[PDB]
Design a protein around this nucleic acid. Sequence first.
RNA 1: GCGAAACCACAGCCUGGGGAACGGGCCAGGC
RNA 2: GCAGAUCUUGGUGGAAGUAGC
RNA 3: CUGCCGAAGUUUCCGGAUAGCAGAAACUCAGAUCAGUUUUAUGAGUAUGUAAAAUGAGAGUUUCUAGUGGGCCAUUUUUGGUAAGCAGAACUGGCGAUGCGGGAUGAACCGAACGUGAGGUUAAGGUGCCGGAAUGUACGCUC
Lengths: 125, 124, 186, 170, 106
Amino acid sequence: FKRYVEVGRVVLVTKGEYTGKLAVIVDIVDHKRALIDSPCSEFPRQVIRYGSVVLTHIVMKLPRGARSGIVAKKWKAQDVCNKWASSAWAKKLEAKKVRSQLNDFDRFAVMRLKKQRREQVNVAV
Amino acid sequence: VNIIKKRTKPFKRHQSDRFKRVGESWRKPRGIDSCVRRRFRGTISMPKIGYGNNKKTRYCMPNGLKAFLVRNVSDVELLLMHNKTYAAEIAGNVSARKRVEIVEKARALGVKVTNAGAKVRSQE
Amino acid sequence: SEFQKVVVIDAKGHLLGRLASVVAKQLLGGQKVVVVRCEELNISGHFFRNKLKYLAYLRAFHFRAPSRIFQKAVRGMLPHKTARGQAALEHLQAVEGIPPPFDKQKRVVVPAALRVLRLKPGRKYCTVGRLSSEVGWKYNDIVAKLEERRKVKSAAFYQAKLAKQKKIASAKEASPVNQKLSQFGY
Amino acid sequence: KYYPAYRENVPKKARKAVRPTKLRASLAPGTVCILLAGRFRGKRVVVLSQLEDTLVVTGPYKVNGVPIRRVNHRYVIATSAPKIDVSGVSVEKFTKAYFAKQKRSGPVKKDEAFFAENAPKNALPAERIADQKAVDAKLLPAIKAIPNMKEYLAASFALSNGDRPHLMKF
Amino acid sequence: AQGHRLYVKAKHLSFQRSKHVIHPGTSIVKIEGCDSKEEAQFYLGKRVCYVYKSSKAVRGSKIRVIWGTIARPHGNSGAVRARFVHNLPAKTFGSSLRVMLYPSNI
RNA sequence: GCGAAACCACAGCCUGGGGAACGGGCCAGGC
RNA sequence: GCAGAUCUUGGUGGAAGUAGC
RNA sequence: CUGCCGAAGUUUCCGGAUAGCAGAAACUCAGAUCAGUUUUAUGAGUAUGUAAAAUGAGAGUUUCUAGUGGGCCAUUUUUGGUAAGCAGAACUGGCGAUGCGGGAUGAACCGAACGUGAGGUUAAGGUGCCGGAAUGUACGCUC
């Protein structure tokens, strides 16, 4: 495998009011629940179930049961932010988020933009 | 003021469509073991006072007027003051000699006639 | 969500009851549903369990083809006694394998009926076509032979499409317009 | 003929006073909005001013050919496209009577057009075109200043496959 | 190509019914693309129509329309309740519908 | 070629369950 | 004031172009 | 034809005379009484009856005058039983005069008792499909 439920793994929340946020497992309550934390201020330390999260490939060195302050310092030290963003997963998600906000005028400018890019067809020319 | 009718379908006698000997006119089912009397599901409806229509709009035609049967010119003159509430209806046995004089009189009186073009032709 | 005028469903790894229920509901929605690979339908439970279930049914016409087995399950989930359920059945075409008209068409799957997403790991399941092989169906061997023949041709088309796709993909970044206004997420 | 001949039940004094319509927040003048119904459905137009209930709207004549017209505010989708400078064009002439249908009149005597049906025809006066020619004069530089605005208003809005109106933002 | 389609595709599912009693006055309409009752709140009050054709032509047009309006959501899966000017025929179950974007509040 | 009468609520495939018979009408299945 | 009374009188059907002569 | 009232289906003596149930009329009363009521306390033996606080409803008559004057099921109590079941009484209501939602279906089961309708919300029961409604969430058990 590539992903295991271990202390220090970075997980992505996919259910509830914290959907789309990033968190790192701090403690293993049980095979169905785990304690997570995030350096972001709006994300508090909480116990979440594995059904509401997906494990990313990023694993970061954390002592068991670290406090939020220590986790935030370790998160900055290990440069987890912009490392997940370097993955194509985050770029796909970020592109989807930016696409959702796009209004009608931006959509119109896109169609003209992708119309110009389409006619290139410089293959075998 | 709009005329509201609680029901437009008539109340047919039960089992009147299975026999020619039993007419369509409504008869109360006296049978005790009858499903129609006990008002099961799928059984037909029965005349109840709940179906009674508004008192103000009772006897009113869809145009808002109440029919008034007229047999001669003297009858139609009674509607001089009630031409916005009543419509003249010439009786079926009134001849064409009198039907024309009722229609001409009802025209000056400003009275609607429900069957003004009956048993006559026109000549412009 | 969004629908199509005609739908081609790949019945490989789909549970019989779960797929039939979704298909029957879609048929009553006016959609036209075509189910291919009906002989790879899976049913939860041991192959002994379904063999006696079918053997009990053998003890009307006892159809042996896997496509007609699936149609029977779909038929029971429709008001076939009325005209509405009669018209729904005529809008379904269950076939074994992938016939040529549906060979070159997109084949969707129903995640609510997929065996992997609905069956506990390690649970014994039986394949409808494999189960029907010992009840009277005698075309399983040839149906597999065409399936591998179709797969080889399908794989060759995919390589041609993938090789062609590499050309536009390479030229996608060649055009500066892509990088110039990629701020829209595109 | 004047003393009331019937009971003539006078209506009871109603207490429904007419208060001004509250338009939406996003239906401001100068907003590029999509017409939802009518003969110009799908056309994108520029809101000049808000009438008592409707929007006095127009698409530039040379862009999409939508004359100065009234549109109901419920039959308009207000897109979030950048605003257009409309403070430079006077809109006091756009009243209820300005758009009001010309009174169906004409003392036609018996026969000729009354019977022979030699009826006359209608035509828009040059006065309406004269005011119209002014508004695009004061609006075309505004739409030309920002990019794609001239091409935006020329196109007609439409829904493609997989477009969910409730989700995607206008 | 690309048509106009200033509306949203929808399907007529059934009447507002219990197990054994139907109420044709209200029809259950599935606005495809709407997946929950909260999403259905956008389409409340919109004008829905049933466009069909008849062989006999009236005013040189063979297309007839029954207009309606979406009233309220039905269930947790985004199906809505619609009342039409004429009750929709029972044979139009599974038939398509058009949900306009007007009246609009966006 | 000449020619009845009895009889006639209406009908007419099964399988079960349907407590009161229920099968011929009812409910779930086949036809 | 009728749908019944193996109701009364009259007319008329399916059985039937059958049984049959 | 419509509308409004509307039982009883049984005490008791014995085919009955009563009574009860349901109406009519005349009376006197709301500062008068009454209750398939709950209490308080007196006593008596957790209950019991009696007497006097809460709650609700205006109450008490007198006269004569139609119908009923079978039961079924269910609940509880029951005495003996006795292959085991059951039988026997009694206690109490429902149906019998009563449609409606559910219960696959069904007269006794779960809700609910009915003018004609629009809208809303629920009960019982339900939300894979037939079938209106989550192929909902969170735990487990079961092959």
